[PDB]
Amino acid sequence: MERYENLFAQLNDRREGAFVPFVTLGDPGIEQSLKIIDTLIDAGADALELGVPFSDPLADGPTIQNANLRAFAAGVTPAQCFEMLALIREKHPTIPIGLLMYANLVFNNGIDAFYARCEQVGVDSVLVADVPVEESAPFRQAALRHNIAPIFICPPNADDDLLRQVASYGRGYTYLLSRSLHHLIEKLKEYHAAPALQGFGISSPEQVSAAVRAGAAGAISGSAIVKIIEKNLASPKQMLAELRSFVSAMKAASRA
Amino acid sequence: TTLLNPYFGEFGGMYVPQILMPALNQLEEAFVSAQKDPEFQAQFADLLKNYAGRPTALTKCQNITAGTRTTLYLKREDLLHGGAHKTNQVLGQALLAKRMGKSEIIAETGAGQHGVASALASALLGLKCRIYMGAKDVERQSPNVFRMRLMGAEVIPVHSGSATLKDACNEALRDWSGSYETAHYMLGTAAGPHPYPTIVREFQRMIGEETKAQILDKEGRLPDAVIACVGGGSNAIGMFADFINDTSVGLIGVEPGGHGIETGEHGAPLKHGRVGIYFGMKAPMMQTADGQIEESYSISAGLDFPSVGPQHAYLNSIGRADYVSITDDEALEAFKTLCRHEGIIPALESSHALAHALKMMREQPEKEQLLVVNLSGRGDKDIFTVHDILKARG
Numbered sequence A: 001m002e003r004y005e006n007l008f009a010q011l012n013d014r015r016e017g018a019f020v021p022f023v024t025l026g027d028p029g030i031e032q033s034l035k036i037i038d039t040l041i042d043a044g045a046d047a048l049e050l051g052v053p054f055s056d057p058l059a060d061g062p063t064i065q066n067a068n069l070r071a072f073a074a075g076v077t078p079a080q081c082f083e084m085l086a087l088i089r090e091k092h093p094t095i096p097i098g099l100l101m102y103a104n105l106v107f108n109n110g111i112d113a114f115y116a117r118c119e120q121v122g123v124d125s126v127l128v129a130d131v132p133v134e135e136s137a138p139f140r141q142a143a144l145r146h147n148i149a150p151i152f153i154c155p156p157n158a159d160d161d162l163l164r165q166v167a168s169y170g171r172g173y174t175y176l177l178s179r180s181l182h183h184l185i186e187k188l189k190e191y192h193a194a195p196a197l198q199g200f201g202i203s204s205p206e207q208v209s210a211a212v213r214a215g216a217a218g219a220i221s222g223s224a225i226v227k228i229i230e231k232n233l234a235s236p237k238q239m240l241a242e243l244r245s246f247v248s249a250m251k252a253a254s255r256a
Numbered sequence B: 001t002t003l004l005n006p007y008f009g010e011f012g013g014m015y016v017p018q019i020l021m022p023a024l025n026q027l028e029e030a031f032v033s034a035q036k037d038p039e040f041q042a043q044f045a046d047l048l049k050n051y052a053g054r055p056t057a058l059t060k061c062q063n064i065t066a067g068t069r070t071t072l073y074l075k076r077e078d079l080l081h082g083g084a085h086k087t088n089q090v091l092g093q094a095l096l097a098k099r100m101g102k103s104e105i106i107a108e109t110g111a112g113q114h115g116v117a118s119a120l121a122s123a124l125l126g127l128k129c130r131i132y133m134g135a136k137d138v139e140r141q142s143p144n145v146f147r148m149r150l151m152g153a154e155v156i157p158v159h160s161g162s163a164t165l166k167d168a169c170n171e172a173l174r175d176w177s178g179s180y181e182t183a184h185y186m187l188g189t190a191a192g193p194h195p196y197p198t199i200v201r202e203f204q205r206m207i208g209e210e211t212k213a214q215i216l217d218k219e220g221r222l223p224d225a226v227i228a229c230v231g232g233g234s235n236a237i238g239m240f241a242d243f244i245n246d247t248s249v250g251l252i253g254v255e256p257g258g259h260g261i262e263t264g265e266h267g268a269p270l271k272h273g274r275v276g277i278y279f280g281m282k283a284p285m286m287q288t289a290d291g292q293i294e295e296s297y298s299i300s301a302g303l304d305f306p307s308v309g310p311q312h313a314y315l316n317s318i319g320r321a322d323y324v325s326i327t328d329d330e331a332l333e334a335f336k337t338l339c340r341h342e343g344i345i346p347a348l349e350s351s352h353a354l355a356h357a358l359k360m361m362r363e364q365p366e367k368e369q370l371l372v373v374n375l376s377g378r379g380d381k382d383i384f385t386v387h388d389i390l391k392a393r394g
C-alpha cells in the first residue's frame, strides 16, 4: 500500500539516495528477463522501473527501441508482462515496482481496468510516457482509485505552472529529466512534490552521486542496464555478472 | 491550457511526452496569431496562387456520367504544383515555421508525396529539411526519394518498428522533442496532437472554399455530396470544411478497403478499427487486440496512415459526414475508367473517392445528384504499380 513512502523513509534514515534501473519486460526473453530483474534486486536496486513492449515507443531512444524488438521477437505480450509482474512481486514484496507505459496499452482494455490489473499484480506506480499532465486527469484518477501512484515527468523546459501541477498530481516520485539548475529540485521540494528522481543521463556511478548531491532523492538509469543486456546477448551469464557489478557500483554511489 | 479546443467531441487531444507540450503550445499561439494577421494571409495567398498554382480547376465529367442523371465534377488538386493537395498546407506550415523563427523542417512521409511537398516548400523558403521515411517505404519509393534529395532534403530511413509510416512518425516526434527550439515538425495530415488537425484543416480548406464558389458559379447550387479519400484526413477535411455548416451537402470520406474489410487487410480504421491513443491523439486506429498499432494496407501507398484525423471521427460520430470504403479492385477500375474516358490519370488514392462516386451513380442511375470528387493527386507516380498489376493478370 505504501512502498515508495517506506523506501524513501528508510533511505533517508540511512543517508542514502535511491538507485532505480529501467529494463524492458521480456527482453531478451521472459525467463532471462526474470533472471535479469532478480539480479538487479540482489545487486542493490532500490526500486524498479519496468517497460512493457509497445510497437511505437515514440518517447524512447534507440537502445530501448531495440529492447522492445528483442521482446517482440520473443513473443512478449502485455498479458505475459503482467504474469511477470505478478511473479516479480511475489518474490520481492517490498521493492517498489513502477511501469513506464504508453497510453494505448493503458487505454486498450479500459483505463480503469488497466490500473485494476496493476493493483492485482502489486504494481506501485505508473508513468504513462505519452500523457502530459494536461491530459492526465482520467489516468491519475484511475491510478488513485486503485492505489497506484501516477508518475509524471518534470522536463528540463518546465515552467512554474507545470511544476505546480506535477507537484499536485504526482505521487510516489517525480521523474526528473534535467542537467543537475537545481532550481527545479528546490521548487519541487517547495511545492511538496513527491521525491524527485533524476532520470537524465544516469549511466555512471558519478552521476548517481551527483544527482543526490543536487538534492534529488535518487537516480534512474533509463538506458544503461538495457545497453549491458544488448552487449551481452551472446552470453547470458556474463550478462548477469556485469549487471550485478554495474548495479552495485551504482547503488554504492548513492550512499552519500 | 490552450487557446483552442484540442478535442473534437471525444477525439483528439495532445497525447505527447511532457517535453513536447511547449512546442505544441508555441505552435498553437503562432497559428492563432498568423490567422489574425493580414500580412501572413497575403503571403500565404501569394505562394498558393503564384507558386502552387491555385485556384485549381473544377472539371465537369461528361463522358463518365453519360446514361445517368449524375453530374460529376472533379476538384483538380492533381494540377497543384507537386501533383497533390499536400502542397497547400506545407506552404502554410513553412510560413508558420519562419514566423516562429525556425530554420529547419522535420517531416515524415509514407508514399513520399508529403516528403516531396515538404522538400519543395523548404527549398522555396530557405529552410533546411530532413525527412523521416520507413526503410520499407524508402525501398519502394525511390523516385520520390530522389525527388526529395534533388530538392535539398535529407532523407532518413527509419528501420525501427515495422519500418513504415507510423515508425517514421515516431522518429519525427523523437527528433522534434530535442530540436524544437530550431526545427518545426511539418506534420503531413490532419491528425496528430493538437494543434495539427486544426492547422492542417485551415491550411487545406481553400479546397472546399474554391469548390463552393466554383460550383455555385457553374451550377447555381451547392453539391448534393462532396467525396474524398481518407488516409489521415487532410484532403477530405480540406474539401469538407467549408461545407460542414451547409447541412444539405453530404460529406463522404472513403477509406481504403484493401483486399476487402472481411480479409483484415485494409486501411479503414475509422469504420473498422478501434479507438486508441497514439501519435498524440485519441482516434480510431489499426491495432491488434493487444493495443499494438498495425499498418494500414492499401494498393495505394498514400492511404497508409494507420489512423485517421480526430475531426473525421467526430464528424462520423455526430452523423454529419459518412465514411465508406473501396477495395483495391474498385479503385483500380476507377483509375482505368478516368484515364480512358476523361484523359485524367488520377492518383490511386483519389481513385478511391472516384470509385465510390461511380458506385453511387451506377447503383442508382436515375437518381439526380450533383457530386464533387476531390482529385487529391495525379496518378503518374502510380502507372508502374498499375502496369505490374495488369500484367500479373493480363
Ligand SMILES: Cc1ncc(COP(=O)(O)O)c(CN[C@@H](CO)C(=O)O)c1O
Pocket (backbone or CB within 6 Å): B084, B085, B108, B109, B110, B111, B112, B113, B114, B115, B165, B188, B189, B190, B229, B230, B231, B232, B233, B234, B235, B236, B301, B302, B303, B304, B305, B347, B349, B350, B376, B377, B378
Ligand atoms: C496523392 C495523395 N492523395 C491522398 C493522400 C491521403 O492523405 P490525406 O488523407 O491526409 O489527404 C495522400 C497521402 N500521402 C502521404 C501519406 O503516405 C505521404 O506521406 O505522401 C496522397 O499522397
Ligand SMILES: c1ccc2[nH]ccc2c1
Pocket (backbone or CB within 6 Å): B055, B209, B210, B213, B214, B217
Ligand atoms: C474563388 C475561386 C474560384 C472561383 N470561381 C468563381 C468564383 C471563385 C472564387
Ligand SMILES: [Cl-]
Pocket (backbone or CB within 6 Å): B053, B054, B055, B056, B057
Ligand atoms: Cl489556375
Ligand SMILES: [Cl-]
Pocket (backbone or CB within 6 Å): B065, B066, B067, B068, B069, B070, B071
Ligand atoms: Cl449525366
Ligand SMILES: [Cl-]
Pocket (backbone or CB within 6 Å): B224, B225, B248, B249, B250
Ligand atoms: Cl444530400
Ligand SMILES: [Cs+]
Pocket (backbone or CB within 6 Å): B230, B231, B232, B255, B267, B268, B269, B296, B303, B304, B305, B306, B307, B308
Ligand atoms: Cs487511414
